[PDB]
Amino acid sequence: IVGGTASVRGEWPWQVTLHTTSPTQRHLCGGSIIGNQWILTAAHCFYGVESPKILRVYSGILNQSEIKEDTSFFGVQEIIIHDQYKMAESGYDIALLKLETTVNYTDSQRPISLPSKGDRNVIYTDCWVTGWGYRKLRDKIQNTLQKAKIPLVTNEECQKRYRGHKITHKMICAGYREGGKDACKGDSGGPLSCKHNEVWHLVGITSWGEGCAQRERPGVYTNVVEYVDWILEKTQ
Ligand SMILES: O=C(Cn1c2c(c(-c3cccc(Cl)c3)cc1=O)C(=O)N=C2)Nc1ccc(-c2nnn[nH]2)cc1
Fold it and tell me: Per 3-state DSSP, what percentage of the chain is helix, strand, and coil (rounded to 5)?
């Protein structure tokens, strides 16, 4: 996260850190708890992942440095990538992780609601991106989970900034005209969380952008409301 600030313990309890353990253990991507056995994340996180056997899902993490050889994690039973996914910039950047057991929900590990039936025309004004990603284009994974408030942009404005890409109704964009706050490398798969009537909804999945926090280059997110039918089909 560029231009963000440290989170506190318990602040974003649907946020997970997805680790690979091949060839060494590291943070790969963010993800969001959407059900007791379900993480919603980005398909592009699994490029070069040989199988779910090497993945670990950690919940209730504030600092990456909390994770030690005895820290409990959820195994991943299945990675469900959207069957039309080809590359982040061409859309369908969405994946479900089915966990090997159920999360018992606590103060540290809670689900986020999908965007709700009847809210397709809500204008979200309170949207936050979170993650352990770089704070600039050439940086490192951050220890402490970062947060940044970012305004949604119209698909029309977003398409005008990305004339070499197809910005579709299945994407949502967010950023400041003068840049400075954005997702960056290692935030992919994490949430764009929007609060409406004091309820959080998982509006976006961090997907791609041109650099990080550049002027007139908003971040591009998977538009979760356009995948609710796909999520319910896969999870039922
Ligand atoms: O960069 C990635 C994958 N990614 C991308 C992009 C973005 C991205 C950039 C700007 C806005 C938005 Cl909404 C997304 C995030 C993002 O996470 C991108 O535009 N193109 C790729 N993953 C990643 C993980 C980990 C290390 C890493 N590990 N150790 N050191 N670095 C290094 C990169």
Answer: 15, 35, 50
Q: Give the other-Cβ count within 10 Å of 41's Cβ.
A: 29
**CATH architecture of residue range(s) 13-111+227-236:** Beta Barrel (2.40)
Give the number of other Cβ atoms within 10 Å of residue 117's Cβ.
Answer: 8
Strand partners, 93: none
Is the CATH number of domain 1-12+112-226 2.30.29.30? no
Pocket test for ligand 1, best of 208, 222, 223 (most atoms within 8 A of CB): 208
Instruction: Please report, in range form, the residues annotated as the binding site for heparin.
Output: 160-163
**The pair of three-digit structure tokens given for residue 122, joined into one six-digit string:** 């809500």
183 lines ligand 1 (CB under 6 A): yes
| Spatial CA neighbour of 3 closest among 124, 125, 133, 126 | 133
Report how far residue 127's alpha carbon sits from residue 193's, in angstroms, rounded to the nearest whole number.
Answer: 5
Asked if 66 contacts 72 with a C-beta cutoff of 8 angstroms, the reply is no
The rounded distance, in Å, linking the Cα atoms of 87 and 89 is 6
Token readout for 74 is 């959820």
Please name the residue that has the structure tokens 């600039």.
136
Q: Hey, where are the domains in the chain?
A: 1-12+112-226, 13-111+227-236
Q: 180-214 in b/e burial notation, b at 16+ Cβ within 10 A?
A: ebbbbebbbbbbbbbebeeebbbbbbbbbbeebbb
Phi, psi of 13 (to 5 degrees): -70, -5
